[PDB]
Design a binder for this molecule. Structure first.
Ligand SMILES: *[C@](O)(C(=O)OC)[C@H](C[C@@H]1CC=NC1=O)NC(=O)[C@H](CCCCN)NC(=O)[C@H](Cc1ccccc1)NC(=O)O
Length: 473
């Protein structure tokens, strides 16, 4: 095990790994107010630079709960040549995530499978009570396996402190950071606590820390409905579209394909589409699979395949897309990204506990994103998991305040479903940095094949040149 204050012991990484990758662990205190107490071990991966090294480019894929080691292995394949020359590509698993120890675990593989088999559409009083009873048992499993102390200190406020310890452990006087999705919350949290330690920062797919949680969720529901509409309009131009040639009826045709997966007389009964997998395709997995495909047009073909299969009451592709979102491998084993996502989210802001607010949010969500709403508004809706969380939040919604921060770049995609375009405009305003706009219907874009975007962030990472005002790719 690594000890507090000890240098990172690098070694060639485990089971082929490219680019002479080095792996190691850094010890951080669980509670920064008690560095004498318990210690967490953060897993790191490192791809040494091939040319004149400026420093380390630390990345985070977001989630929260997504592995940064896994992400750095993917980014290494699409890393521009000049970035690979001047920077060590460094990924890290945040505290409680993936290979970091202790890792957040709440649900067994069967607990996740059992939930996904349920339609999760019954919002009657009995249905809401059933959902909240499962939620209370989920929270109990988190406490039993993790303990309240570690769950209390897993928030982004402590990840930002870990990120500075990572910067010093990597030998960099200042941090060069690329954050995707939730990684932009790590970025802004780090920018507020260590503004004097930021050399460069790129935030792709922005979350606004000043946002109200309800309105942000409804803006994300609108983003996924807009992405659904863009996918359906594209499919309508193509031969044999399973949603028909009229995009104005695509939501109706979509529901004619997914609604039969629920028993029309008993919303608690699943009628799953046939798959080679023994699970079949539940309604909830069909919706999750659709959401997964709407993250990128590279998956739109898979959504079309999944819906054509549903015409014949098959659900193999949509089940695979749902497995991709939930990170369930071919042997039925989940990674801890799902459980880590909940535990990190529940401490990053005060949860919504008002019943009227939760009910009214479901009423508006049904109207805003009809594609992922079943049946009619019932007058009731379940509270989220965080409303039952046993440890208090360690961050509060606020506008990012880092006055002396170096110019940064926020990359925002016009029709991003997961983090809408306006969220990136608002974050760039709070950071008082540059906004780089990408025109598309996808979530994140940096280092993913677009030379316009990549040449912008390459010049920023190396020379500090920010894109001009109104830059579009
Ligand atoms: C970003 O971190 C990402 O894409 O991670 C890979 C992103 C950022 C969040 C969006 C709003 N605030 C954030 O912090 N996270 C996500 O998109 C997560 C993780 C994806 C799963 C990968 N294993 N999921 C959602 O945000 C989710 C999307 C959704 C909408 C409607 C139905 C079902 C899912 N929405 C949610 O948690 O409310």
């Amino acid at each position: 095990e690594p000890k507090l204050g000890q240098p990172v012991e690098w070694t060639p990484c485990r089971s082929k790994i490219p680019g002479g990758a080095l792996c190691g662990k850094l010890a951080v205190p669980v509670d920064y107010d008690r560095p004498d107490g318990d210690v967490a071990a953060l897993a790191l991966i490192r791809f040494p630079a091939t040319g004149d090294k400026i420093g380390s480019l630390v990345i985070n894929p977001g989630g929260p709960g997504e592995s940064g080691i896994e992400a750095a292995l993917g980014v290494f394949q699409t890393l521009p040549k000049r970035v690979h020359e001047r920077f060590d590509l460094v990924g890290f698993d945040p505290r409680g995530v993936a290979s970091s120890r202790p890792a957040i675990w709440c649900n067994s593989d069967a607990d996740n499978d059992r939930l996904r088999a349920e339609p999760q559409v019954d919002y009657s009083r009995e249905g809401v009570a059933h959902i909240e009873n499962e939620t209370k048992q989920f929270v109990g499993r988190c406490v039993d396996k993790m303990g309240k102390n570690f769950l209390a200190h897993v928030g982004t406020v402590n990840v930002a402190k870990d990120l500075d310890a990572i910067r010093a452990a990597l030998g960099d006087d200042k941090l060069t950071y690329l954050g995707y999705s939730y990684g932009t919350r790590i970025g802004s949290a780090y920018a507020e606590e260590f503004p004097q330690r930021v050399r460069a920062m790129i935030l792709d797919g922005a979350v606004d820390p000043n946002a109200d949680p309800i309105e942000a969720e409804l803006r994300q529901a609108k983003g996924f409905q807009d992405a659904f509409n863009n996918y359906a309009a594209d499919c309508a131009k193509n031969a044999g579209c399973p949603l028909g040639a009229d995009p104005a009826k695509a939501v109706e045709v979509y529901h004619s394909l997914v609604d039969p997966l629920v028993d029309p007389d008993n919303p608690r009964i699943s009628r799953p589409a046939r798959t080679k997998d023994p699970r079949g395709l539940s309604y909830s997995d069909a919706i999750v699979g659709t959401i997964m495909a709407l993250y990128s047009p590279n998956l739109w073909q898979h959504l079309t395949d999944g819906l054509s299969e549903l015409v014949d009451n098959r659900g193999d592709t949509l089940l695979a897309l749902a497995d991709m979102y939930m990170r369930r491998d071919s042997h039925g084993r989940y990674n801890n990204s799902g459980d880590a996502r909940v535990a990190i989210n529940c401490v990053d802001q005060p949860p919504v506990t008002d019943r009227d607010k939760v009910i009214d949010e479901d009423r508006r969500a049904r109207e805003i994103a009809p594609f992922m709403s079943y049946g009619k508004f019932t007058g009731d809706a379940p509270l989220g998991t965080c409303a039952f969380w046993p440890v208090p939040p360690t961050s509060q919604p606020h506008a990012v305040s880092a006055p002396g921060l170096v110019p940064t770049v926020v990359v925002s995609t016009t029709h991003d479903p997961a983090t809408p375009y306006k969220a990136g405009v608002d974050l760039a305003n709070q950071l008082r940095g540059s906004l780089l706009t990408f025109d598309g219907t996808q979530h994140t874009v940096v280092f993913q094949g677009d030379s316009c975007i990549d040449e912008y962030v390459t010049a920023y990472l190396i020379g500090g040149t920010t894109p001009p005002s109104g830059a579009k790719c």
